[PDB]
Amino acid sequence: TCPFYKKIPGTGFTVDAFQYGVVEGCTAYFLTHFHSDHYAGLSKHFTFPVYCSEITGNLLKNKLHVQEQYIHPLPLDTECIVNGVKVVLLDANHCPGAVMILFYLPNGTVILHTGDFRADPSMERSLLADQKVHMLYLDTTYCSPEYTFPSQQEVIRFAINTAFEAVTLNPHALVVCGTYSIGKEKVFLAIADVLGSKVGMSQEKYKTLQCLNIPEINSLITTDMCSSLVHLLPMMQINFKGLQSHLKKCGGKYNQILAFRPTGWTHSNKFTRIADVIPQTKGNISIYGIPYSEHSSYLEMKRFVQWLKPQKIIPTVNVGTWKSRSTMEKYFREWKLEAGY
Template sequence: MSTFLGQISEIPGISVDRFNGANLESSAFFLSHCHSDHMKGLDSSFFRHLIESDKYLYCSPISKAFLMGIIFGLPEDRIREIELSIPKIIRYTVLEGEASVVTSLTVSTSPTGHCPGSVMFIFTKDEKSILYSGDFRINPKDLPKLNPLNHKIDGKNQAKKFNTIYLDTTFLSLDFLSFPSRLESCEVICDAVRKWLDSNSKNVVIIECSALYGSEHLFMEMFRLLNLKIHVKDKIYSNYMRISELAKCITLDGRDSRIHACTFKWFGQKNLTCRSDVNYENILTIVPSVLRWKGKNTSCVSEYDTRNTQRLYVCYSAHSSYEELRAFVDYFKPDKIVPCVCPSESTTEFHQLLSELMSYQMKLDVSDQVSESFNLEPPFKRVFKKPFVSKYFADDDNENDEL
């Protein structure tokens, strides 16, 4: 759950993933992806503010499509799309003393593997280069393949140098050392689905998602591996239909499908509401989850409920594990890290792990006889105000049961 307050201290005048309070003084806004903890303040009054002050919101084309679906009457011309990997120059104003001065920065985006349309932002201004990771899950082996994050030197990609990385520290904890890749998790899910469906023609599967949105990658992989459409909840169907890669994987007709993501976990529902012809003994419920694996060995990707063999838990994460975060930071070796997800109570372990992420810098500092080796921002305060979109776009991986 993002606790980042929005302003990028190195580049005054811009705000990312937070659209209320002091951020309204910014003059260019960026949205990394459509999950509620990154959309605080993003409501119709914010868009009125954009119109009145002649400001813009920048995001990926897919995030724009999502936004147009969830906020009625949105002024489309106030949302500007940034295409992946194509640097864009953005002009905005910044206050210098009493005067507003027009200035510019370059921004490019890179995919984050978190949810459809999710991007990282690379901001370049003057001599400064800042990476805002947003929520991400990237196999460290793929980092050299992501052009916006690399320089081409002698035909080979090499990590760009960033002054600061604003980092998704959701699982910066020794309790979440490593996760199976999402493909591994999806294959385990699909194997279980295949076996269950093949064993009886009346059998169906429920995918129990803890939030309304957040399982899109899983649905797309399941469709690719099983060639079966997934019955999704009515209220998300029209939004999914805006995205062609997702539209082909889903259906609105429960009778049409043997895989159902249409049930609501928080009602404790065990049967299908879309079909009355399916008995409980014909339902296998699969629960993609990370928190169940907290502190456990994740080489065991799935486990059945000890009291119910029709309930299968599968370790599945759309955020990086501790080891992936280490590899990410070690690849770029930034001068500074700002954690974007801080525990509600600032723990010693969290700060120790943050320091360890920067251990390459410590080595440098030791040789330079510098005693203050870490350059970490203080943790941000959690804000518990409920965002207006919370029940629509909560992030699945947070297993936010209040939805």
């Protein structure tokens, strides 16, 4: 049945709640972002209003064939009225089109639902700063102190310099990057840019990227693999078998592959600096796991909450075991006592 952490009290609203059929009493279904665990259930046969960003609305229309009359896109940073309730969508610093939602309940309670986010100090100067938030529905993906990772900037720097060096030493080397969803476009776009190439990909992926309002995208991507030295493949194919096979498909244009797997966290991070990342190598194939995250580190999350000072926290991730729930509640209490709210 729809779980309680997907319902917004005192409204008729749910958030990311499309896999439970008709939710009794729901007048509006919000979708934070276009990732499958969140949209699971939508299709062309859905006949209730869906509230979302413009980018998420392009993907609903074009990839899932949801009918236009049921897509209600909202502008960011703008007070809107939905079924008599004031809402605002804020940028979540997750994947393209991903938002956080502020609800202003008629009784004066204010609720922020973060969707999936990577907390950043820039959020401390959005419309969030203008009033108090009483309840926080929080993306707790990495809510444990072992989860450290570098800035997105430092990771992209690593990747750019690695690729540029490899291709300049060997002009017959191909670069491959894995993907299974939207997000992390900076990885493959930044590499293509330094190498003076477009990124080549399947028609299904090209279609997905054309929904995203990326500036000058027609200048950066293509479906012509032959003219490109940066290829995107499904993440599943990012292994020695998958890449040897792909290399055979290129017809002796290339004699070496350098491949990137943007993973979230991997326990090499407890010890290893970004400077000290090494690849797995077999033959003329090398694979780099790089820690490009679009979720909050533990410290980033803690800082955001200690700034926001909410009265109640409701986790939305890692809620399925008692030991996870109990651990998170402990961190919440630590943060609250250290900061004094």
